[PDB]
Symmetry: D3
């Protein structure tokens, strides 16, 4: 899908509580990605169980779903060339301990259960999570004036 | 009322296009205010005309309304003591020329017809603007861990 | 006297707790002031009522002493031309509501009882506060390479 | 001349030595002004005597000219609506002591003889200083892609 | 050779348009390198074709050359120990996708055909590129006060 | 042990002199580590050769001791899960040439003898260095409100 690829990102409850929302948004803005959906939300455990359905057998599954519902998250959709892969690169490893300085988690986090943010792991997960969290009318198309200075 | 006062803020289309959303959000976060609503919307002229109803007869009203409808805006509700009056101070004068460095308009723009942000001018205006832009179930109540170090 | 004037500054418990120590220090560093003493302490109530002796008969005095004692404070001494008066300008007005953006309290604080920093109000108060918080041996003399570019 | 107004700015030798060139440039970029000339230069005392000709009777004139020639300056031309007036607002008062936090001098400087930067005091001085420091071919015209988000 | 090694750097037209000049300059300043030449130029295709002579037969050569000529570039010479190799590390991989967060390309862009900066690839290349872009009298020798705290 | 592991960090004389203390502190603060001791000192040569005891027979040992004694150092103790190993990752490789951008030395330093910071290399070295630089009464215990958002 080229430069029209989209990913689902969410600032987790710890990110909101630590006042790192603007700090997170800025990292993706300064990179050149296009913000196309944004929402402050109180995620229900039902949505979170489906969001993390792949992890249902894991010992930390219950804790994860409860933590993600214990406070507001900032749900987001970002657009650009390799946005899924590259957003993951900017996030850093799942475990902050393996994430180098320079990444969100390397700069801001200690522990895997309190990493600040979610990013889709693949284009298939992205497509699944976009539809899960957002309605079609919540996804905005806009002509970026500086697009020519990011692409070609 | 009190620490429970709320204000309506909006990053205008130039804020999104100039990649200043994270920059704007960060400044209210670090000030100590609570983010209680957030969404990226593409506003109709109809909404904006109601939003700026009092400016109906102004020579610049057409330009304002079109400009606000020209791109996505980030709609926000912030909560805290004296948040309406204080957010306006953070934003700076309507004309960025009269807005001192240190303010959002002082640091980040030039002209009155492109001043990167809207803020409610009073508690009564905030009350009308919140209801106009948000459904009541888009306004989130959450226990902020940071209020302990901001309030007596 | 002159370029060798000194002030006492302290990051209050809310400053440490909100992780704003580095931020505060950076602002005095980038200004070109010379750091001559620095220390993390749990100041005893006995020390704090002598520090705030002049506010004895104020209603808030009691809970101001108890608060400043309720956590670690970063005590420091800064040196430079007009440091006392210039520090207070940088810190901002006592009530953060009166403190403009660009100042520490204008950027970071909401309420008077949680204004993340103390600064000596006069040259004479500075001499007194410096002597009360530090021993003579804690105040360091060091050749300031940067001085040749900050002074005529 | 509207949005086509230009001003001459120079990072003084102290600004270069303190590594504040990028920091200075950033303040004018983030404001929305257009950089149209840029040059690292070793200013001769002959050029500096003419640059500051208005000050020839002043007791500090010799010292000023010698300081300005003791190291490289970053000579610049910036363009935009009220760029002369507004650049001065961003610089802050001549004497750093009268310049509030938020301005270059308020944030970064102590003493009048070591203020970090020069800005034209008027459009007439701007026109004089542009021609003094730059040849016509050193002034570049470029179409700013985000111009529509700064003007109208 | 030694601390006297020099490299040619250029902020490409996208760096100027995305207002990242001050951001780029700040990163070499804070690393400890000495700025010895600086100018904003509008490069001819002829200069750029010589600059990228080795890429003459590449399928993207036309696009590169036109893009580089499409807007003003900031030409620079930086000086310091291992400055060529180290600047390249600061810049990051040619393709911004392979450039880790923390690098200029890692933080600030997406695509290989719009990577905001050029850096010499070797001491021999730097020598050719400096002579190509600068006259010898545009290269400044100045006694840096900061070298004392960067070098043994 | 665990979340209560502690490391010793020191801003070396070049760190203080280059006004990078606030910068360094901020980076450990934003990471979520807890500051438990802090102090500006002129460390005696006798202390420094016992601190660097293990490097006795190294050629540089002599001038390393004398350098670290030639100016004020900011001694500190930080606390958190895996703080020792994570601090060293944040600081970067001993030779800044091997230290990637995003790390402290990768961002700020050029040469091995002027790498602006020391950090304990192991848990056992930390216990030893902490005890050597601080008295038991200088290491503070305080309730970390932020901990509930950094740990599971
Ligand atoms: N071992 C664990 N203990 C507690 N929480 C975990 C653990 N592993 C993962 N998590 C949480 O669950 C989220 C989803 O895990 P996973 O899908 O493996 O990683 P990612 O978010 O990188 O795709 C993580 O981002 C993290 O917040
Ligand atoms: N004279 C003008 N010319 C063009 N646009 C204007 C003018 N005055 C105001 N505006 C636009 O209309 C908005 C609303 O105006 P107003 O309510 O007076 O200011 P504020 O938003 O600061 O309360 C302003 O923020 C600005 O975007
Ligand atoms: N009305 C008040 N209520 C609560 N605390 C106050 C009040 N006024 C002052 N304080 C506290 O007492 C401290 C010292 O008071 P004062 O000397 O008046 O201000 P400053 O610290 O700006 O010099 C202030 O920093 C503030 O935290
Ligand atoms: N009293 C003084 N002593 C030393 N240097 C001064 C003094 N006054 C001004 N200067 C230097 O001379 C420059 C030019 O002075 P002036 O034209 O009055 O101010 P400005 O630069 O604000 O236009 C100042 O920016 C400053 O660097
Ligand atoms: N495959 C490509 N497609 C488009 N542009 C490219 C490609 N490879 C390189 N370029 C452009 O040409 C410039 C010079 O290429 P090269 O010398 O290989 O890299 P570097 O500039 O990192 O030394 C690159 O910085 C980039 O702007
Ligand atoms: N080859 C060298 N030349 C000069 N100084 C050195 C050299 N190697 C190490 N040092 C200095 O000695 C300090 C301690 O050395 P070491 O323990 O090897 O590194 P680190 O401090 O990263 O653990 C370093 O921080 C550095 O300043």
């Amino acid at each position: 899908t080229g430069a029209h690829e989209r990913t689902f990102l969410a600032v987790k409850p710890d990110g909101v509580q630590r006042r790192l929302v603007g700090e997170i948004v800025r990292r993706f803005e300064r990179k050149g990605f296009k913000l196309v959906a944004l929402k402050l939300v109180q995620a229900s455990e039902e949505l979170l169980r489906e969001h993390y359905a792949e992890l249902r057998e894991r010992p930390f599954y219950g804790r994860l779903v409860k933590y993600m519902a214990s406070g507001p998250v900032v749900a987001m959709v970002w657009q650009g060339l390799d946005v899924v892969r590259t957003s993951r690169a900017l996030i850093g490893a799942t475990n902050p301990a393996d994430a180098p300085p320079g990444t969100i988690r390397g700069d801001f986090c200690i522990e895997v259960g309190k990493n600040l943010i979610h990013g889709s792991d693949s284009v298939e997960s992205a497509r699944r999570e976009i539809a899960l969290w957002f309605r079609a009318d919540e996804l905005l198309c806009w002509e970026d004036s500086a697009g020519h200075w990011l692409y070609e």
